């Protein structure tokens, strides 16, 4: 019994160009626990990425939050790459403004 995760990319505060924020990537409802999560900026990988305390729901399916402080530029393209045991090729989820 293996579950594909549900990937959701969004900002901590409502988006404003030039002001500081945080880019969140909330991975949830997957099994087993081994999940590789990376935050991206114009293709390139974000080096400094902090993550939340792993927890599991009552359906024993884990959830995590990965976030990074960022200043949304006008032209900047942000996304979230995720790979699990259930994924043959990593899923990339673009941030929508």
């Amino acid at each position: 019994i293996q579950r594909t995760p549900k990937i959701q990319v969004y900002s901590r505060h409502p988006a404003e160009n030039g002001k500081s924020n945080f880019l969140n990537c909330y991975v949830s409802g997957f099994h087993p626990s081994d999940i590789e999560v990376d935050l991206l900026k114009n293709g390139e990988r974000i080096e400094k990425v902090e993550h939340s305390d792993l927890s599991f729901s009552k359906d024993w399916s884990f959830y995590l939050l990965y976030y990074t402080e960022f200043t949304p530029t006008e032209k900047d393209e942000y996304a979230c790459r995720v790979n699990h045991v259930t994924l043959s090729q990593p899923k990339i989820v673009k941030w929508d403004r």
Binding site: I1, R3, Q8, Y10, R12, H13, P14, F22, N24, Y26, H31, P32, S33, D34, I35, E36, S52, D53, L54, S55, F56, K58, D59, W60, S61, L65, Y67
Partner: protein, 265 residues
């Protein structure tokens, strides 16, 4: 309608995403304590936990858990051998209870092998609900040790709700169930050249909220696309609901007794 929960996780061969043992506690949605097979120490994951709790508490529960680490390894190794399982496998455990606003209390104890229900404790009959023949042989060994079943029953029935009450009096966020949502409505272009109305609520606490869209007062669930309640990181949450605009619409939100209706120009 507050709750206290502690879980345990054990993994066989974790090639990256180790360690083999992790134990984390929560008062509602707040992480409070942590332990893992690497840092063989129980630690606070909240500031009001660092203060208020004497170093005796951490030392006693570090020793306890170091032992629960060894039991978990044994209990799991055993499980894979009763099956014909090889490789990496997951074993999870969960205790805790709730304090319902009326005054009534609940409390649970569950176990799972590979994210599937294995053993469920019924505290009112001091019994285990075994899933297969493997679980039934483990259940049988557990039922003979009566004082353990009573220790568990009593921990939920007494000790757990007492501890939750103490943790809640170290709450100026946990006890505080009032942080109102900040709702805004903005037109998006979901498909070219289709426009959609977006209701966006943020910065609220606790995370229980309800929002909907209504065409001329009629709520149309089949035309509405709802978003999940999400963590922000700052301890507050965000959510949204959207509607497909055709060639009078209003947004509705309820949160901690507060009721608000927003209307599009």
């Amino acid at each position: 309608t507050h709750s206290l929960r502690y879980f345990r996780l054990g993994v066989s061969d974790p090639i990256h995403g180790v360690p083999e043992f992790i134990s984390v506690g929560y008062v509602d949605s707040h992480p409070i304590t942590t332990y893992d097979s690497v840092t063989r120490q129980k630690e606070p994951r909240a500031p009001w936990m660092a203060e208020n709790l004497a170093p005796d508490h951490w030392e006693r529960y570090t020793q306890l858990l170091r032992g629960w680490q060894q039991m978990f390894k044994v209990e799991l190794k055993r499980l894979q051998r009763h099956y014909n399982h090889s490789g990496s496998h997951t074993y999870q455990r969960m205790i805790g209870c709730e304090l319902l606003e009326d005054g009534s209390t609940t409390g649970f104890l569950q176990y799972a092998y590979d994210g599937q229900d294995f053993l469920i404790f019924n505290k009112d009959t001091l019994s285990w609900l075994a899933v297969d023949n493997v679980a039934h042989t483990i259940k049988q060994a557990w039922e003979a040790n009566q004082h353990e079943l009573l220790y568990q029953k009593n921990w939920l029935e007494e000790e757990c709700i007492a501890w939750l009450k103490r943790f809640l009096e170290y709450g100026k966020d946990t006890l505080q169930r009032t942080e109102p949502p900040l709702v805004r409505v903005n037109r998006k272009e979901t498909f070219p050249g289709v426009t959609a109305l977006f209701c966006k609520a943020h910065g609220f606490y606790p995370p229980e909220i309800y929002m909907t869209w209504m065409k001329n007062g009629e709520e149309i669930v089949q035309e509405i696309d709802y978003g999940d309640i999400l963590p922000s990181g700052d301890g507050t949450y965000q959510a949204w609901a959207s509607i497909e605009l055709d060639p009078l619409y209003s947004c509705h939100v309820e949160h901690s007794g507060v009721h608000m209706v927003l209307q599009v120009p």
